[PDB]
């Protein structure tokens, strides 16, 4: 079946033969509600076609004739077989000979959107998944030398603010940590501002999501321009003396073809509207969760020393490169090692009494 | 077959091409009744819907037709697949066309029953899995302390009740231990707190069920409405004069069409509702399983340190992510190092008989 | 075809994707007769069903029809699976029209009682796999140290025996080595007393062989009742006129249908029975045995240290969880280890010779 | 297909996933004839049912009708599958209806006969298994102990016998090792002692061969009785007016009905009967294999230590499990180790001779 | 189907059994858009093959003939068979005896486009593969020096510069490390002024670029010369009497032949000319991409020492084989160890300002 073949090239990953190393294992490079959108709007036409081609049908004829008796078995084959490469309507109301091509190419039409979805995914496998592979990897392989340099290196504050009264030494002593060369890092505030000034990942998002928008509009014109006149029409009245049959005695106009699969038709050309009328606010989700600064972990990130850098750049037009590697982050940051202490510091979320808070909480995160 | 690719793309895991890592390997985040509901409720429709297009009817024709001897084969089958699309029974008691509508989209009813039932698991694999696998890491990474603080270095105690009157130290010497900076964990009281009073995971849980039950309470209208009608029905007189054949010399009323797969309809209709009326009541102790507390092993608990803290957090409204998260661990508590020494302590069922009991039995459990 | 798919689905191990770990490589949970009774109570009735939908008859029709000759194809086709459907033997005899519905529901029947087979099986898995796989890795473990423990550790005795007269020390002398501390396990007399007073598997163990026994005398009832009546009947008289048709001119009592596959139900309603008398003795042997003690091997567990607390326990009424635990036990204690020493000690089945015997033989077992 | 199923399902090894360690691997628990014994009397009524159901006849109907020229194709269809469920030849020699079940029967027996000879196999895996594998592997274990103990702790007599007069210590200096301590084994004297007298492994192997020569003489009883009747009947004269058809006008005693597929039945009634004629001298060899005692390498056999022990053992009644145990070690003795030592010995074939001839041979077979 | 199999011996890796070592595991052979203009180019003429072939059209017959009803079944289906391999329209209008035989040899005209469309594949894997791959396999060898050759011994240069005035030490002191040994590669000035006067894989990329676009020019006169003829050509009167029939009494001109597939064959000369005119100006980009020089990053390369040679051989004509193993360097230059350190420079794009830049920036990328 070429739905079986189109489940494994399509819709799911086709780089490497895999097995190759980290390049894809532990690298979520998709979001998840991405993935569902892609699922959804590749599968659907896919699973649309199989059902037209499934066991629910046992093949037969899709579109049937009543010929007359005289017809013999061979003849009335034929003069099935011409009315579906000829389906036009020849009513009597001059002459409109109404066509219903769309019942023969409803397949085509759903192999072309199931083509057609899958331009986006190509479109961001292949302009922003390196950049964005490289930029993630750059960031979490910097972000991962912020343990054994925010606390291990750090403790010697304890030794300093247990010789004296703690809560002094909890609010003067710490600028001179904050003036220290190692505390910062030196490149991570030049990384992010050269980002903020780019603007590259940004529009690819936008483009990748405004094709599924722009299609799936185009999807709503096709089946509301070409279906929605043939879908209560199910006998049309088709002729055969249109050519060298012309000269014969036999009936001129076979009255009162039929499509036999209409109900599928029918069934088809609404699943195709519901399922994506599911998926049109789930695309304007996606572009606004994009358009709307995040500021619900500010607090806990900013006492940290690396993601105070992030936590600082929060100001300026939303559309910046750092916005859509941080939604893409905040989806990784989880990976395998801030899977421990990170998840810890959820209890801070109500500079007074965020001061002590830390007097046993921050020592105790400690890995031994 | 349809089935056949919807056994594994639904009704299992998918996420990842496996064999990754401690990400699902030795962690269960699905219990198993709610496994088995799953299974029953996303799988049976699909089996009916198998039995449908089994083997069991050799396809043939889902229905029939007595037409007159005049007609033709071609004929007759076209007069036998224009009432597969036009199911009215057009009674002569004004003008009822009463429609069976049901018979053709029963497959269609069971593809949607399937994909309606895996709303809710897509629901907890979306909402739920990351948080509470989280939270279980967390948790069991914590509480894997608790055999060597518990015992190795708590065997001094050991020390100091064999040298003096060993019952007199059972009593008066514990509140030293208890007042210890090591013996109790100084975070483990914070994060249950602050778990205390979030309702994340409750809500999850509520609604993955609430989901169900409102999905098998519309199956049950859905059969109740549109079946129990077209039960006992099997011949319908159908009209194919009804357009462009009216000026035609034949069967007005083609009387006596025939639903061959009838009884395929009435026992899936019975079998819908039998394989439900079993998961109704499941559903609801999976429901009351977080609305009781449970109190049958606090004894053994209380005695051990680190779960000295999960006991005392007994009290209050039972609504609090603690209750999912103790119903995830219980089950999950005996991964594969609890499982030596917990299990252990299932005598002390019945503080006088308890303070020396633990004479032999405590410093029995050694690992050497 | 469905019985491939329950091949897998169901007769076999359903739990994780394999290659786990010690869950279940070296860990015997079933039976063998247990496991066999399973295969041949479960497999059996899908064997059946396969062999009615096999190549032995290539599909064609369960029901042939004597149509008149005045009826064309598709008249005699209608006519045909008419009575497929309308299962009523219009008898002349007032008017009782007796149904054969078991022929259609055969199918039907031979998978509600493979379904239904099955219920023991998910009982166990469910119910008493993780309590008895618990108990049996505890006693495993705890018994792996009774080999460095009764000869390694006891070797010393034979010092002292040889200096003395050997045959003296081998019966003043035994009481020191019975009274020493490490001698004996401080655990496992409180283990298998807690054990003794607790009736858990053996009640899961009760009714698992109880639900096959009252499954077969369901079926049975099923085949004594609904079959055994149409047995011998090939021919019933259907109706057709019974409807709109009842305004026609065509034979109203169409005689003489024929159920095709009269000899496939006739065959099956005897392999169902016969192959079921064969498992009704099997299931109570099961029964008997946990109820029967077993002292065919006590005098030479009775010499061992650690097994002496499990012969001394040999006393009381048969049904208690120590009972499935030694029956389980008995079918796992050759693993790896046990299977190099234990069964050396088979020569002794006839304590006065006995005291000698162990003059070479307990020495000469070392591993070196 | 069901032989398909039946290939791997059956005729193989249904134990464990494999790849699970030394259970299988490198251990021969049946022999190589009694192994194409089984393969031969298994998938030799297998391979006849699949040719019954092969393309060599491409499905087609198993019983043909000469019904008349005014019966339709529903009618004739009916009359020629009413007598496939009614094969009863309606003879004018009183009324012998004499019947024709076996070709209906033929693949049920030879389901029946396939499953029957698989008894032997399922007795001897769950009855003699685990003990005969655990002896092996004892007995096994226990010889591997004869080459680091009858060459290398015994290449100092080299060093006595060099000293003085070769020939003079070739036979006054070996009564000095056989008196040694360490020379015998002090346990294989009394396991071997312990196994004459018991009686467990020779009922299981006379068991298993009687099984599969009482089933090929039920064979020939049934294709005696049964068949060699209905050989050369191809014509039998069935009626249908025996029922609900009496009271009508058509041919009474509808004659000559045709077994299509005779020629199938006939060629399998005699490759049911050669191939297993072919079986029956092969199963009594296998019988007197047992009951014959083997001296034929005792020669070499007696010369090295350990195997002195067992070539003593030479007397006694043949039936015994040492006999079993022999004939499944002489088939595994060489598994890994005795592969390179045990076969030098060869030469010895025809003590005065060999009391010389191990003057260089033995000492040569050193392993650097 | 031939395209399923096709599938994998075309379109893919047809070298080793794959998992062998480094030849192609991290090695990118082919650039993206070469290989989805490959992929499209070769599997849709086989995917439009599939639909000639798919379940669209359930076989039937690719011909239909309007025989008279004098004809049985036997000669109208001669008579239709007849003309599928006579395809000549016998019109009136001398004896223009039209063929249309592009309709039989669609699959096969479209195998030939598939294999043809597969020939600048086998060119490039036969003529440029062991080339390029040596010579990339030199590049990366000799440039993965150029990290511990470039600042860990270039970092003394830091202890000059911070002992005097560092801005001073930032111009006037490099002179003395750029006049260095160790500072330049010896070879690579002389590797690649032998690579630029070499023109040996250019004129294999221009010939493979060239091939497709040559075949696709011929597949658009295919299409222009023999379809688009008979496109809108559904009847055609066929004869039969053209030999040993001419001596008969039936239809001389059997009128009216009709194609059955005919919206197959328009679908497709329509489908196979967008999708190549998609692929027209994609060809053209791939052939512009090494016509034009690149020199939008020459900034940071110039700064590196290693890759300051590239740098420098800017000018000349655009036709060279470096400009093929750059193109190639540049979608392989970040495999696993650049990919951390080169990615860091994309802040310098705007030598006064550069000259201070690196005053942390470089030293800040050290590994530890």
Same mark, same amino acid.
């Given at each position: ?51 037209? /081609? ?171 321009? /070409? ?8 006998? /049309? ?132």
């Amino acid at each position: 079946s070429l739905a079986h073949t189109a489940a494994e090239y399509m819709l799911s990953d086709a780089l490497l033969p895999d097995r190759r190393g980290p390049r894809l294992k532990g690298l979520r490079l998709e979001l998840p509600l991405d993935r569902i959108v892609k699922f959804v709007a590749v599968g659907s036409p896919l699973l649309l076609m199989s059902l037209a /081609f499934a066991q629910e049908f046992s093949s037969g004829s899709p579109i049937s004739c009543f010929s007359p008796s005289n017809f013999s078995i061979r003849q009335a084959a034929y003069v099935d077989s011409s009315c579906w490469d000829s389906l036009l309507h020849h009513k009597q109301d001059q002459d409109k000979m109404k066509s219903l091509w769309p019942h023969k190419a409803l397949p085509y039409s759903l192999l072309a959107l199931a083509l057609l979805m899958y331009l986006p995914v190509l479109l961001w496998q292949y302009a922003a998944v390196p950049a964005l592979s490289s930029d993630l990897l750059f960031i979490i392989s910097e972000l991962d030398k912020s343990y054994n340099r925010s606390i291990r290196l750090v403790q010697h504050m304890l030794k300093i603010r247990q010789k004296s009264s703690d809560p002094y030494v909890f609010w003067n002593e710490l600028e001179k940590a904050r003036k220290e060369r190692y505390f910062e890092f030196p490149l991570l505030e030049r990384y992010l501002a050269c980002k903020q000034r780019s603007h590259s990942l940004v529009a690819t998002y936008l483009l990748r999501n405004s094709l599924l928008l722009i299609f799936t509009s185009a999807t709503y014109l096709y089946l509301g321009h /070409f279906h929605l006149d043939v879908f209560f029409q199910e006998e /049309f009245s088709c002729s055969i003396k249109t050519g060298l049959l012309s000269d014969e005695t036999h009936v001129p106009n076979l009255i009162t073809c039929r499509l036999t699969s209409l109900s599928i038709f029918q069934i088809v050309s609404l699943s195709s509207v519901a399922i994506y009328t599911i998926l049109v606010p789930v695309i304007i989700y996606n572009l606004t969760r994009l358009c709307r600064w995040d500021k619900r972990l500010l607090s806990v990130y900013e006492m940290l020393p690396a993601f105070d850098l992030l936590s600082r750049k929060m100001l300026g037009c939303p559309i910046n490169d750092l916005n859509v590697i941080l939604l893409f982050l905040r989806a990784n940051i989880s990976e395998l090692i801030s899977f421990s202490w990170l998840s810890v510091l959820c209890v801070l979320k109500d500079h007074n009494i965020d001061t002590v808070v830390d007097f046993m909480t921050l020592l105790a995160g400690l890995e031994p």
